[PDB]
Amino acid sequence: PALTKSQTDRLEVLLNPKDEISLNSGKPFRELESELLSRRKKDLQQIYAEERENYLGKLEREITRFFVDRGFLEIKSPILIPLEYIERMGIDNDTELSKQIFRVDKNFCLRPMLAPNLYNYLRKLDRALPDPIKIFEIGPCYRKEGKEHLEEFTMLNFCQMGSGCTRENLESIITDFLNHLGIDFKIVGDSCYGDTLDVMHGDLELSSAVVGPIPLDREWGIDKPWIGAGFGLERLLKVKHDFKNIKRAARSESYYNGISTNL
Ligand SMILES: C#CCOC(=O)NCCCC[C@@H](N)C(=O)OP(=O)(O)OC[C@H]1O[C@@H](n2cnc3c(N)ncnc32)[C@H](O)[C@@H]1O
Numbered sequence: 001p002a003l004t005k006s007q008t009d010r011l012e013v014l015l016n017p018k019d020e021i022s023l024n025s026g027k028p029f030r031e032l033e034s035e036l037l038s039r040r041k042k043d044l045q046q047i048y049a050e051e052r053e054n055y056l057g058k059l060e061r062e063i064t065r066f067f068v069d070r071g072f073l074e075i076k077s078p079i080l081i082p083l084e085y086i087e088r089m090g091i092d093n094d095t096e097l098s099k100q101i102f103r104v105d106k107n108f109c110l111r112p113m114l115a116p117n118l119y120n121y122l123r124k125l126d127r128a129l130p131d132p133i134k135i136f137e138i139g140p141c142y143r144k145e146g147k148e149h150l151e152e153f154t155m156l157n158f159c160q161m162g163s164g165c166t167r168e169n170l171e172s173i174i175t176d177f178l179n180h181l182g183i184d185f186k187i188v189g190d191s192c193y194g195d196t197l198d199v200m201h202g203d204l205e206l207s208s209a210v211v212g213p214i215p216l217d218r219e220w221g222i223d224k225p226w227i228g229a230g231f232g233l234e235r236l237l238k239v240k241h242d243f244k245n246i247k248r249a250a251r252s253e254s255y256y257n258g259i260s261t262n263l
């Protein structure tokens, strides 16, 4: 008897990218399932015996090291932010991203992006720190949203403001970063300040990057050249570990380092 679609779905939960097992050599479902359960249990046992690190935590630590070592100040800013910051980001009450915001009270929301707090840090730090100002943050962001989007995700955003804010410098930082992580990519932009660049892995967007200045800056009291980019950590993990589904890379009770916890 052929496997049912439901049975196949169940085995796929238990399958890890490089399992050499074949789902069509006569073995009944129960046997295939039992084999995969054994393997996934042994995977968790191995993590628990040796490293004990969560991939999302560990990636955050590796990225933090990378940016700190290259002169960028580590920021930890609020996750719960004023709703006014979203409007000030140019996201109107009729925009599609406006419908994706998780509101919390009359006045607050879960940040859907790192830009507003980083804008405020850039303005504030310009009074204390020498040119150029280099900062980054990694942490949770939220958007009401498939196989590439999560409602709860983790962004890296880095910024430089003042001298050296060129397209070439931005591309070089992106290039050093992803070659450090071991992640294949191409940078796409219309090749003729103002530019947005997409960092792609095949069809998957890893990042949107901006060469400022842009008109939005004045809303935030910023009037200097700047460059920056945001990367989703769950996307980076998905690519690095070859997960078929991004939910395997997320904060989750169903997956641990891309291993099913329903065993
Ligand atoms: C001060 C200052 C200025 O600083 C800056 O603003 N500097 C320039 C950075 C601007 C770009 C960026 N920061 C941005 O605005 O969000 P995005 O919608 O473009 O998506 C960014 C990335 O987040 C991930 N991502 C987004 N949505 C999701 C999701 N639902 N699930 C998983 N991953 C996601 C994914 O990797 C995507 O490519």
Ligand SMILES: [Mg+2]
Pocket (backbone or CB within 6 Å): 205, 207, 208
């Ligand atoms: Mg984008």
